[PDB]
């Protein structure tokens, strides 16, 4: 480093956090559903949108039993959710730390259109981000989430969208690492479209290559980062059927062609997939015959808890049973990231 | 345009605004002194920093006589200053429009360090900028100012700083043009250092080339933009003495090597220069024997009003006389941007 | 310049050559038809392809009367054609210098496919180019031609092709300027396709912006260069009919949005256009109401001499008459680059 | 792949060649000493420079015993050396194939200065490279070598030099893979200078990141490539002493931060190092506690054969003994790339 951006102590801290997140059998739980998204989910389960509703939803998910201690290496919370307290009164980050995980917080402020593109958007949130990261690390958070959205179309992702999303991801990563927070670079490719699996693999390769070029450009310490990419899955309109083995082969091939080995782990996202589909795909990815020099685990916000949310149904009396459903995913996903999961 | 970013009506509006700003004999007045900067200036003149102080300072500058009608093509205001009212009670943008100018507003939220660079910084402010631009155009503002800071050092400006400042400038320009506001791209090179004039010219050429590459990348309509670059002036520690003719030659050479002709005008900045130094340099630049296909006018926040601020001295009774000093610059600067100014 | 690439004497020489090429009423004659192209032309006129055939073809074109002294500011020759001698025995560059022009030589060695693109190609020729440029300047040549080919398709020009052609153009320009030769940057967009005029303008803007970014990157002295772009003309399959005024508006708009004013002149290419079509389009471009800070002249290899080639018909006795046809274009084109041409 | 550059059969062939080159215990022998370099070496050993001299030098090295069958996975030859024949009369590629290796050929035509840089140079050789690669694959060659030179100075490597060398490396790689030849990307950093090990690591990280960005840009199939980087070794004038463990840590750290796992192997270069120094450094690199997902072997043109060249001394009678010295390195280097080498 000509002008170092991190002291060796800071690099040690970021490496420790990142490796404790993606330790074998551990994955990320995503409770980052903002007001609109959690309102949509609560409408789906027939519940009104209030702060107490999110509070008992987190009580359902965050305050689970001790069986999910190794499964959940970390959770990502929302701002109010990070500041909210449990029924017992203890703060939620304290609950997560007692459970054994690490607290994370969604940082991005949403997507804003790019002028002159076919619906391509970039993500904002960089204003005053250093102060927010300092405050969130004061509040027990040790990693952050920033979601950038790129879509596969006939003429998209354009060069402008790819480089702009990569640059804002790198800026967010630098600001996070300057404040002791491990960034999660999340270039997320939408599964919408008629594109087949080969097209998705090609676009994922290009996007990840530009992402890590931008990370190298901004002097990002790669061992203090995580990756949250979409699995290489064909579009909903694609008539060709691809087995889980083919999904795993394409995904691991893209990650081996792009992601440097200094990345501690790759935490995949749901991307509209079902819980069983995501579990089987993660198990196949962890069972790929290729050489995989980074941890391949999960960061799911829908797969782990769709069954639990349906079981709760806006009712308190189902709580334990609903919590059971959540465990029924977490343990299973702990087997998915270890390549030890057997469906049915 | 594969996917057009502006309708022809919007392009016409931006072209009209930009050309009315830099019409012959017209320049930009910069009243963008934020709380810290205006507090420093008021401490220099021995005045406390309150909202009423800024209010009567703008009353001194904005509510001048009718002799400055052609000289001042537009002014840039601060958020409170744009929302503030005069002693008569009329809003300041109404005063500016009655005077004949066009209202502008400083948009950037300040500079934030870049990790891993020798003090290089980027500028933030993109969060929710479209809504702010819509509100400001509802408030009579038609152009905006975003100041990016690049400095000439032994190993700076780095590639990272240059491309990051160019990219954020292009993003700000696209957001502004999407809301009917003409952006002023302001890559400002600090005069600090021991570098000579050749080094400053080289760095200015590289920075402007990257700036307009980024503007082309983000589909910026160049005719709806303005440029606010520093004149090619050597550092304070540079022992070599450069005549105003050499300053003009280097500046116009850099602008001809970099700036496309679609740019309606180039409004220079003070950059720590004195009022007479800036006036003479602008007059020499407008008298350069080369072919200059864009308007070369001024955007001064110190040169036009340093004498007026000193004359005011925190006292109301000097008002008219202080206003006279302001006029003593504006008329002169109207001669500087027409190449018709004679010192002494 | 941190490490200068040209001494002031070299910059003066390049500026002098470039400005003498594009002096008002002067344009470039292109005799760069390689073995395949000149063989195709001679087959079209029913003549076999030998060295003597090219020799008397150049005798037809190069050894014209004194009426074409101001019209032809320079010619571009082939390697053998540069080394060939006239019927009188004087070398062809001596003939050109006596006529009043400046000798140029085609430098590029042809196009080679880019792997992984939809037929996109880059241009080779950089190997040992400095020695060849030194030899050619020893042989009276003062400028050079390098043709890069980009095509407008559904998904082309790709980012790879655009940046690669721009980079090889900049490398060729740097090598030429290091040896006293004024490069002609020729990013040529094929008119093939169903794309309309707006698409061609957009692609031309992007290509020219990347070209001049690459020229700035390689420290090219812009005043020692020329530009040979295609006019913004719709595809052959485009059903919409665009007037010459619209062609001129789109072309000058692209050039004003992209080309810096330091470029001494822009010498357009035929691009499959007819002689009268090219003459009328150049006349309209020179009559555009916009501000055009660079010379807008011609570099034609087909328009100036198609009539002369047809008149010759592989026969010596038509020589003078065929030469007359050539003059019938050159004078007319001298009126086209001055905006003084009247059809019929 | 939107427009595939290689059929699956071609990818299989390139993967097979690349993995057979860097199979465990195998490395590259470099006999690429051009006329000037081999003349300098022969002057050092007191021998005149003729074709027969190179012929018996290759007879010394290429026609060794059967003990070097697993050690030497491949050799890189010169054009004449590839076309030369042994004393028995069998062609040298046949000798290499019988020994068990794979034939390679140096492709680059040398370094040419970059205008406007502090001595930075780029490499030429792309002209007609596809035909040469086709001919060389017809002559038994299956991989190629292209050496690009970047140097660490006070202000170098510049951005221009880094991106230009990366782009020409990617172009060479694409041309090679289009003709069944596995390219060796060789961005070689000169050890000249007073820079310490941290500076060399930083520059190596940036150069490798740009190199693989350019490889991704040109659609290079990474599994059909090899890498030939310099070990992260401080300058000759650097007063600080770095242990072999520190060299290994810095080198593997740079490779893990930059090189994707799809690269079959990384074959280091001598870089002016001694034979024992290179062997110990390679052994330490193969013994690094980090996760190394690519083969880490050698590509030495001086370390393997300096002792053999000194033992030969321009005399035939020492042949066997000199060959013994060559074996004394090869076996040792087979232990260096397996992490099984013990000095003394």
From TrEMBL, chains A, B, C, D:
Species lineage: Eukaryota, Metazoa, Chordata, Craniata, Vertebrata
Location(s) in or outside the cell: Cytoplasm, Cytoskeleton, Microtubule organizing center, Centrosome, Centriolar satellite
GO cellular component: centriolar satellite; cytosol
UniProt organism field: Bos taurus
Any one GO BP annotation for this protein: fructose 1,6-bisphosphate metabolic process
GO molecular function, one term: fructose-bisphosphate aldolase activity
Family: Belongs to the class I fructose-bisphosphate aldolase family.
Xref: InterPro entries: Aldolase_I_AS, Aldolase_TIM, FBA_I
EC assignment: 4.1.2.13
Pfam families from the UniProt entry: Glycolytic
Subunit structure and binding partners: Homotetramer. Interacts with BBS1, BBS2, BBS4 and BBS7. Forms a ternary complex with G6PD and TP53; this interaction is direct.
Task of the protein: Catalyzes the aldol cleavage of fructose 1,6-biphosphate to form two triosephosphates dihydroxyacetone phosphate and D-glyceraldehyde 3-phosphate in glycolysis as well as the reverse stereospecific aldol addition reaction in gluconeogenesis. In fructolysis, metabolizes fructose 1-phosphate derived from the phosphorylation of dietary fructose by fructokinase into dihydroxyacetone phosphate and D-glyceraldehyde.
Name this protein carries in UniProt: Fructose-bisphosphate aldolase
Pathway: Carbohydrate degradation; glycolysis; D-glyceraldehyde 3-phosphate and glycerone phosphate from D-glucose: step 4/4; Carbohydrate metabolism; fructose metabolism; Carbohydrate biosynthesis; gluconeogenesis
Catalytic function, reaction form: beta-D-fructose 1-phosphate = D-glyceraldehyde + dihydroxyacetone phosphate; beta-D-fructose 1,6-bisphosphate = D-glyceraldehyde 3-phosphate + dihydroxyacetone phosphate
Alphabetical list of NCBIfam families matching this protein: FrucBisAld_I (NF033379)
Major localisation: cytoplasm
Major enzyme class: lyase
Keyword annotations of the record: Glycolysis, Lyase, Schiff base
